[PDB]
Structure 1
Amino acid sequence: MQRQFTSMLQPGVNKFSLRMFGSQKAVEKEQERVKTAGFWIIHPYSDFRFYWDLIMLIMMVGNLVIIPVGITFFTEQTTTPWIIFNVASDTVCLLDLIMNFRTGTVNEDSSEIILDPKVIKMNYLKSWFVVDFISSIPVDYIFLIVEKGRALRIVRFTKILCLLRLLRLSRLIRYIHQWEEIFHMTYDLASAVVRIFNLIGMMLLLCHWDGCLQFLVPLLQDFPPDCWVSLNEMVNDSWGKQYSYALFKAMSHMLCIGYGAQAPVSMSDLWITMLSMIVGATCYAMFVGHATALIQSLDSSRRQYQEKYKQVEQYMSFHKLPADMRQKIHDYYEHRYQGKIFDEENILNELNDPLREEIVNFNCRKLVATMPLFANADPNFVTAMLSKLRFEVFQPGDYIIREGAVGKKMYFIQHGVAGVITKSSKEMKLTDGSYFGEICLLTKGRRTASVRADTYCRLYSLSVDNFNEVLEEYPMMRRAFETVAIDRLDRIGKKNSILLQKFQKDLNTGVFNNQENEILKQIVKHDREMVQA
């Protein structure tokens, strides 16, 4: 029995323990720390704590609802089921009070308190012991026994002292908050939804309590003729009708609907009504605030994008761009972001190297599969090349490369078809997967031919600095780039002596040409087949 009880009395390896502690090792360290101190000391995150708190929440929810009804609307409620229920709740509350002295505390400094006699007992005694004690002992039964050891005074005192059990709302709120924060940090719960559900539960409880009180106050006054119960002539009505009307009055005060049958007449009725109105107005204002917060949190993703585009529109209005230019900017913004807010330069920075590598490899899977030069070399080179590419979107008809300008980047086409146009040759179509801009980076010269975006082109651009940095690590890939750059230059206008000298020097050198020649031939054939489309 001791082993099974202890195994559940200490924290167990699960989702929440894995997110709390570093790993399994820290979980076992915490288990050993819990097992070391005291005979039985309950960890706040243990399964026994969870089940005991679930039982306590169920009991308090069932008690805070039934006690006021059984006290107010029921006369001479000292029947066997009532004493049985009261005694059961009393003993469960006493057991909870006892177990609270061996449960530890979660300090706000991210620490767990385990030491029993010096900090556990000495902190619960000076924080919540009096509230958890005067709401746990049967004060009404103690007073009845004392007096028994003219009955209107006794009945009134018993009914008044039975309201001390309503202080269990403190324990209910504490347990609800603790386990809701635990579930919040375990699951992906929304803060606004949890808070609005807490407020809805509190509003229902307060409305029920106000409904009970608006009849308890006339009941304690022996139903004066000025009270609403006597005016409506429902003194002898059934408990269901009385409770329904009292709850109706309380909820009408809460939701700002008005009064019951008429305006209050007696002073006690006036003050009870005004207190109920204050409580209900405060609760409804809090509910409106929570609803506003929830509605604002629901559409944050779209609202942020709308704010970004409104800032863009403000910039365009400041610079006084024409209508067609503004339409082009809108089209590009709506084709590039597609109505979504994010920033890759920071999202990818928040991730680690393996996750970023996996995401980039998944993004360019078709580019790797289609590229003749990719998928046929060292995959470390492949991931190094892919980790430096930048996503770009070019609208149809946009000159993405202009001849005569200096070369600073090349592009790998992922989506769409581009067109290479030269002043001395017909345009050649480049489909998906193909790439351009190699010769400008290789020869460090000007662009040879222009490139047009025939359709909406989604391209991956590689800067010259990153290209040289990744290519100085891998020269076989540089020779593979040259073996097709020379071919393309000879196809357009030759004048490729800068790369031709290096290629001839490599051919004359004793390099591993047995596989290099085959790789170059395959790459050239695939590139010319792709460009022949």
Structure 2
Amino acid sequence: MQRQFTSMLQPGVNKFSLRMFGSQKAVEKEQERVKTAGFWIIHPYSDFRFYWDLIMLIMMVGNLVIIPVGITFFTEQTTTPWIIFNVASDTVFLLDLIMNFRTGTVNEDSSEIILDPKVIKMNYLKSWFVVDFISSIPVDYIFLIVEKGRALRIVRFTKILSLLRLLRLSRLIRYIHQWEEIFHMTYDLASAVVRIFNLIGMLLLLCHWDGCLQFLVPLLQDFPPDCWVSLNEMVNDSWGKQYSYALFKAMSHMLCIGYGAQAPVSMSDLWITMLSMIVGATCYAMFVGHATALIQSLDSSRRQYQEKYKQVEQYMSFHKLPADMRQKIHDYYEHRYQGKIFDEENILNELNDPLREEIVNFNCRKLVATMPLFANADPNFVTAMLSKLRFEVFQPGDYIIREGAVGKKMYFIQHGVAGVITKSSKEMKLTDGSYFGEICLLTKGRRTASVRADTYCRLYSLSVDNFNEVLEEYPMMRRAFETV
């Protein structure tokens, strides 16, 4: 029905279009846009364009493998099975040429998709149409028909024309790039992994085509007596032995492992071998470049923690700190960050208000809810107070607060054992989940006791400056703080 026919050719409401246009009402504006651009236009982000390009990619990967083998290793392509393959492929590649006059273009400025038929047509003619045309039509068969109005020169010149089909590769590169840009904003892709697998496919294809070229240049010269096919005495072999040898010869040149059975002798074999070496050595260097970029993407977190740490070593070196002070700093960094590099202030600033209060409640509510000052309070005050907590780590034997020093912060133990000490009492231990320093909120001057970390304390602190800032916004709580 025409409802499904026009539904297929407009950008459907899905994961990708919602993220590209911003809302279902933005998608439904772009739909209305194409539904009024002209008759039977195709949006680049349509399901029809997806499924067509998926058929094209399966056609192209098949033709670019089979075509140079069929031209090189078989005596003629005028038999029925080869006529059927080449006519069936060429009509599909000609439908694709026609649909490119119907399909809108994504703009480099992300502006409103080009959908006027006169601009979609005019931009294709100024770009890919000539390369897409001469690789779509059966140029070898129309030339052969024009010749019907010696045979072994025509049967050889048509092989060179028959390879104009290899320019389909330009559509393969273009249509792969367009669907990778779409799957990137859909499926959470590592860019270096995607670029590695595209290059491996291209390298295997170049090796395959060089393999055909190694035999094709001898074939077009009628296998002269100084070429590798004559020297290895394999002109009369089956197509599968000839192909396997030619592929082995190409792969040997391109990996720079050797020449095949012997070094070249004829001028054609010299220059085809040197071409293969230069192309293969260039392609291997690009592969090593991609492998290096993939490997650097894979331990970036560890690299970055080591760069951070090595700047801490530079600081201690510049100040000439003693070896036991350096070990104490190193030991603090390992307990405080646990090998992880992140910047908490940047990460929390990038979030929204719902995500920040959800993270803060997960970290801190199980600590602060147990304290009698907060067990009485309204949740919208508690969430505001928990956002002022600062995480601190202390090593064994550190004084967290000293008796007689001025109080400025309270502390809540997440982990580790502390101990409070005074001349008037025993050394009372405090453990994971407890709190201390609380009196500093509601006083001035001296702390009454010393608190010292017995194990590695992990703890949250609240300062008087922040506790007062969070009570300027809650006057109904300040009266209870002065009365409990």
TM range (shorter): over 0.9
The C-alpha deviation readout for 1:363-415, integer Å capped at 9, x for no partner, is 12421453344454211111001111111111121101112222222212222
- Is the 1:41–1:114 contact (alpha carbons within 8 Å) kept by the matching residues of 2? no
- Kept after mapping to 2: 8 A contact 1:144/1:158: yes
**SS, match of residue 105 in structure 1:** coil
Give per-residue Cα distances to partners, 1:191-213, cap 9 Å, x unaligned: 10111111111101100000000
List alignment gaps of at least 5 residues for structure 2: none
Decide whether the 8 Å contact of 2:422 with 2:449 is kept in 1.
Answer: yes
Q: Contact between 1:411 and 1:460, CA under 8 Å: does it hold in 2? A: yes
The structure whose Rg is larger is 1
Provide Cα deviations, 1:33-89, integer angstroms capped at 9, x if missing partner. 111111111111111000000000000000000000000001122221111110111
Hey, what's the Cα distance between the residues in 2 that align with 1:476 and 1:114? 60
> For this pair of structures, how many residues does the alignment match?
484
Shift of 1:330: 1.2
Q: Is the 8 A contact 1:43 1:104 kept in 2?
A: yes
Q: In 2, are the aligned partners of 1:398 and 1:453 still within 8 Å (CA)?
A: yes
| Aligned-pair CA distance for 1:416 | 2.2
1-side partners of 2:385 and 2:113: how far apart?
52
1:424 Cα deviation from its structure 2 partner: 2.8
Rounded Cα–Cα distance in structure 2 between residues aligned with 1:479 and 1:119: 72
- The CA deviation string for residues 281-311 of structure 1, in whole angstroms up to 9 with x for no partner, is 0100000000011111111011100111111
Q: Quick check: 2:420–2:428 contact (8 Å CA) kept in 1?
A: yes
Contact kept in structure 2, 1:252 and 1:260, CA below 8 Å: yes
Distance (whole Å) between structure 2 residues aligned to residue 397 and residue 478 of structure 1: 37
TM superposition shift of 1:482 = 6.0
**Which residue of structure 2 aligns with residue 402 of structure 1?**
402
Structure 1: 5+ residue stretches without partners: 485-533
* Contact 1:438 1:481 (C-alpha < 8 Å) held by counterparts: no
With normalisation by structure 2, the TM-score equals 0.97
- Contact 2:226–2:266 under 8 Å retained in 1: yes
Superposed CA RMSD: 1.6
In 1, Cα distance between the equivalents of 2:465 and 2:344? 20
- State the Cα deviation string for residues 82-114 of structure 1 (Å, max 9, x = none): 111101111101100000011111011012434
Q: Tell me by how many angstroms 1:326 deviates.
A: 1.4
TM-score, length of structure 1 as denominator length: 0.88
SS of the residue aligned with 1:370? coil
Q: Deviations over 1:323-354 (max 9, x none)?
A: 22111111111111100110101110111111
Alpha-carbon distance, 1:24 to partner: 1.4
Secondary structure, aligned partner of 1:189:
coil
CA distance in 1, matches of 2:24, 2:42: 20
Contact 2:42–2:104 under 8 Å retained in 1: yes
Map of 1:171-320 to 2, 5 A cutoff? 171-320=171-320
Identity rate, percent: 99
Judged with a 3 Å threshold, the aligned counterparts in structure 2 of structure 1 residues 336 and 260 are, in CA distance, closer, same or farther, namely: same
Q: CA contact under 8 A between 2:101 and 2:117: conserved in structure 1?
A: no
Cα distance in 2, alignment partners of residues 330 and 481 from structure 1: 41
Q: Secondary structure at the match of 1:462?
A: strand
SS at match of 1:25: helix
Preserved contact between residue 41 and residue 116 of structure 1 (Cα < 8 Å): no
Q: Which moved more, 1:289-298 or 1:456-465?
A: 456-465
Deviates more, 1:148-157 or 1:378-387: 148-157
Does the 8 Å contact 1:392/1:458 carry over to 2?
Answer: yes
Q: Return the offset for 1:480.
A: 5.8
